[PDB]
Amino acid sequence: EKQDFVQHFSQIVRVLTEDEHPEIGDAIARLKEVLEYNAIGGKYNRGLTVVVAFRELVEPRKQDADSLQRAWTVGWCVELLQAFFLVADDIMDSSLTRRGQICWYQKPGVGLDAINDANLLEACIYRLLKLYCREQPYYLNLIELFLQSSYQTEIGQTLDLLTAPQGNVDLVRFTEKRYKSIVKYKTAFYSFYLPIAAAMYMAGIDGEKEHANAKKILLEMGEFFQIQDDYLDLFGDPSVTGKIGTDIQDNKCSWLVVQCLQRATPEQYQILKENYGQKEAEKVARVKALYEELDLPAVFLQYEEDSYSHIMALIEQYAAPLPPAVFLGLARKIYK
Amino acid sequence: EKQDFVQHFSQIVRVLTEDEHPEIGDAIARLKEVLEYNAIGGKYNRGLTVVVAFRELVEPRKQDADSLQRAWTVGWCVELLQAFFLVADDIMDSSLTRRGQICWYQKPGVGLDAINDANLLEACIYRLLKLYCREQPYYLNLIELFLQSSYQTEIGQTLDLLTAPQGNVDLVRFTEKRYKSIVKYKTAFYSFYLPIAAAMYMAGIDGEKEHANAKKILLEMGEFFQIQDDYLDLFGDPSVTGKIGTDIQDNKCSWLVVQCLQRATPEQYQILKENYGQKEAEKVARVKALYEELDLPAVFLQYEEDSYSHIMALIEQYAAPLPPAVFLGLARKIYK
Ligand SMILES: C[SH](C)CC(O)(P(=O)(O)O)P(=O)(O)O
Ligand SMILES: C[SH](C)CC(O)(P(=O)(O)O)P(=O)(O)O
Ligand SMILES: [Mg+2]
Ligand SMILES: [Mg+2]
Ligand SMILES: [Mg+2]
Ligand SMILES: [Mg+2]
Numbered sequence: 026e027k028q029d030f031v032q033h034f035s036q037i038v039r040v041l042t043e044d045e046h047p048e049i050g051d052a053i054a055r056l057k058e059v060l061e062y063n064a065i066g067g068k069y070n071r072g073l074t075v076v077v078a079f080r081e082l083v084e085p086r087k088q089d090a091d092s093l094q095r096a097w098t099v100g101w102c103v104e105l106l107q108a109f110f111l112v113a114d115d116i117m118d119s120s121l122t123r124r125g126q127i128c129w130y131q132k133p134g135v136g137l138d139a140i141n142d143a144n145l146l147e148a149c150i151y152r153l154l155k156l157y158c159r160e161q162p163y164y165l166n167l168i169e170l171f172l173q174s175s176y177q178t179e180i181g182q183t184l185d186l187l188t189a190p191q192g193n194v195d196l197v198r199f200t201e202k203r204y205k206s207i208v209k210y211k212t213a214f215y216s217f218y219l220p221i222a223a224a225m226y227m228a229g230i231d232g233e234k235e236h237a238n239a240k241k242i243l244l245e246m247g248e249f250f251q252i253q254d255d256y257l258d259l260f261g262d263p264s265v266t267g268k269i270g271t272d273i274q275d276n277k278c279s280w281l282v283v284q285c286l287q288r289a290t291p292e293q294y295q296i297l298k299e300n301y302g303q304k305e306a307e308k309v310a311r312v313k314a315l316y317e318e319l320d321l322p323a324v325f326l327q328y329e330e331d332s333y334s335h336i337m338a339l340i341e342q343y344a345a346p347l348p349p350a351v352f353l354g355l356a357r358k359i360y361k
Numbered sequence: 362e363k364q365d366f367v368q369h370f371s372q373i374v375r376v377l378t379e380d381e382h383p384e385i386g387d388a389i390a391r392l393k394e395v396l397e398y399n400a401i402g403g404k405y406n407r408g409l410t411v412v413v414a415f416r417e418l419v420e421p422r423k424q425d426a427d428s429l430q431r432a433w434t435v436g437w438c439v440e441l442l443q444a445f446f447l448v449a450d451d452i453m454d455s456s457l458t459r460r461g462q463i464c465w466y467q468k469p470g471v472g473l474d475a476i477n478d479a480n481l482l483e484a485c486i487y488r489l490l491k492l493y494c495r496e497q498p499y500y501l502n503l504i505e506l507f508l509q510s511s512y513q514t515e516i517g518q519t520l521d522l523l524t525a526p527q528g529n530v531d532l533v534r535f536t537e538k539r540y541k542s543i544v545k546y547k548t549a550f551y552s553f554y555l556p557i558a559a560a561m562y563m564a565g566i567d568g569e570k571e572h573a574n575a576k577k578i579l580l581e582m583g584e585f586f587q588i589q590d591d592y593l594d595l596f597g598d599p600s601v602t603g604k605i606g607t608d609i610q611d612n613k614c615s616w617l618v619v620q621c622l623q624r625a626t627p628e629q630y631q632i633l634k635e636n637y638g639q640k641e642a643e644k645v646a647r648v649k650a651l652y653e654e655l656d657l658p659a660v661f662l663q664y665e666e667d668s669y670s671h672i673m674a675l676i677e678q679y680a681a682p683l684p685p686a687v688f689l690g691l692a693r694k695i696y697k
């Protein structure tokens with residue numbers, strides 16, 4: 026499946042860089058490269074989650090070719106939305122690696138121009154939309170689903186950065202209420218609701234009750250998944266995560282810090298207060314220790330299981346009347 | 362007129378920050394501030410150009426209150442589009458002052474998070490759109506006019522930055538063909554076509570021939586205007602331009618450099634080659650001299666007049682059947 030999708034990336038790049046009024050050749054050529062370097066290289070859970078959902082929501086006699094092309098085109102839009110959020114996300118959290126290569130902003134000859142780059146990735150979404158789903162009765166729903174998805178992410182990011190101000194001892198604010206809302210807006214909405222929703226809309230399920238149903242599940246799915254990102258960020262093989270964890274040194278509000286702050290002793294609350302948020306490798310190495318000294322990685326395993334079950338309970342109560350293997354499939358793609 | 366518009370800014374900020382699921386209070390509060398600090402402080406040519414065009418394109422018996430509220434709401438969207446392009450534009454060209462105050466990214470406690478800030482400004486546009494022009498038969502035209510306006514700007518910016526790579530002697534590429542297309546995409550499209558167009562669409566003129574007509578004019582208007590920005594950037598009272606010119610040190614492709622490169626002697630082509638693009642105040646002070654030694658500021662005056670006339674010729678040939686004082690009004694707001 027993954028391989029058929031990636032095969033189509035070529036068709037989308039050719040639709041996007043065809044433009045060359047040849048007065049923008051250079052700009053187009055530039056664009057092409059930003060797409061290759063930033064859309065490609067990932068897992069493709071999002072882009073894939075849509076095309077697999079369509080098939081399972083649209084009758085075989087309606088899964089025509091055109092309806093297919095529109096299927097993964099919308100697939101790649103979710104990709105570009107990610108490509109966009111990422112490219113800008115790296116500059117902000119100040120990253121070095123993404124998808125096992127150096128961040129685009131870090132590439133010699135990019136730096137802060139990446140900002141316009143991330144912008145161009147956004148414009149490509151809605152450019153595809155107009156180019157395939159235009160004559161369709163869901164076109165305005167797609168668009169309004171992307172715009173409100175971004176704004177939710179963008180809000181969640183605001184929360185994040187707001188909760189982790191550079192050089193500011195901020196353990197006070199690392200509560201769970203916050204972490205949940207933060208992840209709900211910057212991750213759960215666009216990485217789980219968005220793909221499914223696009224599917225439904227494309228299949229004719231423009232319902233409100235339906236959509237709130239999928240949302241109920243998909244959102245809870247999305248919280249776990251970020252929780253996963255938090256862990257992987259610290260305790261995960263860089264060669265498999267294709268990126269380094271900057272959460273500590275970035276004074277982020279992680280599940281981890283929320284976790285450690287929860288079961289951290291008075292004496293242990295400082296080692297913490299003192300080492301979190303600094304860029305000092307040993308100050309940071311000190312943090313990671315306190316985690317390991319708190320048995321956290323096992324505390325993680327627990328949740329990973331208790332969460333799984335609850336999601337499953339959830340799927341077993343709200344999926345109706347959608348093919349349960351629309352959510353079941355997601356929770357095989359991430360809950361591993 | 363200007364004062365009635367600015368009065369309404371309060372109503373828009375209150376629509377945007379009302380939101381406080383109070384789980385995003387901080388994010389909203391943050392948002393409010395990014396709007397105050399970045400939407401306010403300008404001339405308001407764009408926001409104003411729409412509300413003044415509506416009145417002149419919609420019959421008095423149709424200019425009801427609601428249709429008015431929708432009028433300047435769309436007015437402020439063009440503002441936010443600017444607020445967005447600006448906030449990100451400053452970080453990229455590395456500015457210090459905008460609207461006679463320090464750039465948002467420069468404010469202590471912002472820096473690169475401004476990127477998410479600029480993003481939030483965008484999301485506010487389409488959030489207003491959905492909030493006022495939703496039930497209207499032009500809603501999808503507005504949206505598609507903004508998205509394709511941004512993408513045009515974003516392309517033009519790509520051109521700019523592409524044509525002025527940091528620390529790279531780039532006089533070769535400062536041709537006029539380039540400068541025209543560059544300005545056509547990063548300035549003319551969204552600062553002149555966009556406001557008028559939004560007006561027409563709102564008034565019922567969804568025509569293609571009509572829209573190409575206004576575009577013919579408005580675009581040529583927009584080229585002059587950037588040309589104006591180029592000059593003001595160098596030869597303009599900072600206390601009236603509320604910002605400093607970084608064009609030389611940013612190795613930009615200005616009308617000026619295009620102008621000086623045109624009538625620069627062999628011997629004079631270097632002083633140029635040597636001093637343009639450097640951050641050295643005296644290297645830059647050297648450039649400004651060569652301009653003054655080339656009589657350029659008078660060469661500017663000429664064009665400002667020959668351009669004016671041509672635009673006027675243009676208005677006197679394409680405005681029909683729109684109130685000519687829809688373009689005439691613009692060319693009193695800028696051609697001064
Ligand atoms: C996925 S997006 C919201 C960015 C992240 O969530 P961050 O917020 O921790 O930088 P990451 O998982 O990509 O690291
Ligand atoms: C208006 S927008 C495209 C940015 C500028 O045009 P720049 O391209 O010279 O930075 P400026 O006039 O705002 O300086
Ligand atoms: Mg982040
Ligand atoms: Mg990151
Ligand atoms: Mg992470
Ligand atoms: Mg610029």
Ligand SMILES: [Mg+2]
Pocket residue numbers: 450451454456
């Ligand atoms: Mg600038």
Ligand SMILES: [Mg+2]
Pocket residue numbers: 590591594608
């Ligand atoms: Mg300028």
